[PDB]
């Protein structure tokens, strides 16, 4: 059996495609074989995304793996919702219960609000980026209004790379009006390093302040530069490097060739790459469950036009989403178990605090506790 799937990747995702290659080589099976058709197109421009979707649908795929921007989520929830094609993603969780949307990143708002209620704050700043939606901003504003807090919430995403030195200077000059001490940084893996570098340039990392790196990749950024400053700075981690399987994957990861696999000659790994490596295992386990349930869904590359009027679905894909909700495995993000919608249940997020010798885990968080 040959199962043809589609895979979309943005221009610039080199480490995630390398982790996809490692997951495809490592999780090969005996009963069947996957065939990913890879499209390296832009993720923000929805026209190229729709072209890549219809080009993968013209090939007649059974599943589509790939990323999506916050600017084009309502496209992906539409075309995968009507045509009944499962879409597996390591990107941010959507706002709602969309069918055929299987997602790898757990909720960050609950752990972040739990960390604030553990630290017992009342007046803090919130520097957010406008590229992964505004769900976390609405969550912290709702819980701030419900818990009587004072949030100085500032967008930072509209600042260009040409003059990002005087804007940050005026930003942290305006943050000294009310004598703000505690700042939550909700940015991606690229903006956090620039903000930390400009804080270090203006000198606001001494003992007396606080920072929270609001993502799953707390060890992804360069933390050798605010380690000896040592205010408190904390964050969230999804990849526990002290496990056996994670340490084995790191020991098999750092030995790889940089020219053969770009972005693999690091001691650590980005969280999206780990979610991709887990999603390959999820798709392999679901296809193995269909190979073991004696269900023949084999066809050819004649799925038709994506803009068919009316585009009639094929019902055997409806079980395939019911395949993906029936997967409970163990990967780099710990336990992987899904709900009826497509979100993640029974997960674990470690709360890291950066000490002098390095980051040290102080506890874990789940949704049932």
């Amino acid at each position, epitope marked *: *059996n*040959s199962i*043809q799937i589609g895979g979309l990747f943005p221009r610039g995702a080199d480490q995630e495609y390398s982790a996809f*290659r*490692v997951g*495809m*080589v*490592q*999780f*090969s*099976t*005996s009963e069947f*074989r996957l*065939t*990913p*058709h*890879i499209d390296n197109l832009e993720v923000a421009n929805s026209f190229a995304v729709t072209n890549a979707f219809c080009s993968q649908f013209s*090939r007649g795929v059974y599943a589509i793996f790939g990323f999506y921007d916050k600017k084009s989520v309502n496209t992906i929830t539409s075309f995968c919702g009507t045509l009944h094609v499962s879409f597996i993603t390591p990107s941010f969780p959507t706002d709602g219960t969309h069918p055929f949307v299987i997602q790898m990143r757990p909720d960050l708002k609950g752990a972040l609000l739990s960390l604030i209620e553990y630290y017992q704050w009342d007046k803090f700043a919130y520097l957010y980026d406008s590229d992964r939606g505004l769900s976390t901003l609405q969550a912290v504003l709702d819980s701030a209004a419900e818990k009587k807090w004072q949030v100085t919430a500032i967008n930072v995403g509209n600042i260009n790379n040409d003059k990002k030195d005087e804007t940050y200077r005026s930003l942290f000059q305006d943050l000294e009006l009310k004598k703000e001490r505690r700042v939550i940084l909700d940015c991606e893996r690229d903006k956090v390093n620039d903000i930390v570098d400009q804080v270090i340039t203006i000198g606001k990392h001494v003992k007396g302040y606080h920072y929270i790196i609001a993502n799953l990749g707390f060890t992804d950024g360069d933390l050798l530069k605010i380690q000896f400053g040592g205010a408190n700075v904390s964050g969230f981690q999804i990849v526990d490097y002290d496990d056996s399987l994670v340490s084995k994957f790191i020991e*098999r990861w750092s*030995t790889l060739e940089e*020219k*053969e696999y770009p972005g693999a000659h690091t001691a650590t790994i980005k969280y999206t790459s780990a979610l991709t490596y887990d999603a390959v295992q999820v798709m392999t386990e679901a296809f193995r469950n269909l190979r073991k349930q004696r269900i023949e869904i084999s066809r*050819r*590359g004649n799925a038709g036009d994506c803009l068919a009027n009316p585009a009639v679905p094929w019902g055997q894909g409806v079980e395939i989403e019911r395949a993906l909700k029936q997967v409970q495995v163990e990967g780099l993000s710990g336990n992987i178990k899904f709900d009826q919608n497509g979100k993640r249940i029974n997960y674990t997020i470690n709360i890291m605090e950066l000490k002098t010798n390095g980051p040290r885990k102080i506890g874990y968080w789940s949704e049932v506790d």
Partner: antibody
Amino acid sequence: QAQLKESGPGLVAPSQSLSITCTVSGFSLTNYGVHWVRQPPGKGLEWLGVIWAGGSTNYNSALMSRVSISKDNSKSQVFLKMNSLQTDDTVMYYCAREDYDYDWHFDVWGAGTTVTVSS
Amino acid sequence: EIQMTQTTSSLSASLGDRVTISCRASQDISNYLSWYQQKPDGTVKLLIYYTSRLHSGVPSRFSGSGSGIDYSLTINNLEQEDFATYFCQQGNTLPLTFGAGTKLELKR
């Protein structure tokens, strides 16, 4: 660079065993797959089988009860056993490595050996 | 299963010619085919991956194209080391049936 060298007995009697040893270098055998393929002289090449890094092994549909593959990661060696050989087993054997570059492809192959099954 | 075939068994060319080698399949392979080279001593190397891309370590003189069931490899200029056996390998459905394999020859 990665290299592969196959070795065997060369001459064996009919309906007997045949052990081929493939040694790989320049890489590791704990994270890649090794595919063994036969080649008849003057005919088309046939895929004998393949073994994965996760202990998975697949064989051909017509001779599934005739070939076996094992590996030793300490010496980076692959041992291929073939029993119930016939007179048409005077062929060549090759071992190669598998990879994923948007398709399941063969990246680094070997020199291959010649096996002549005759009594 | 899917049977691959190549009608051209031997091609003759001189130094500096653009030689083409075609390959057909029994069904649509969705361009999931590779083109490999094999010297007469037994050494086998890879030349073109996924029917359009060039592998790291191969020169820029060779190229590949095609669609559907018809794939093709092209050499811009034949060299002395280019005299080998070019073979096509499909990788869509198990078992991975390879091509027939053509052998380049020097024209004199």
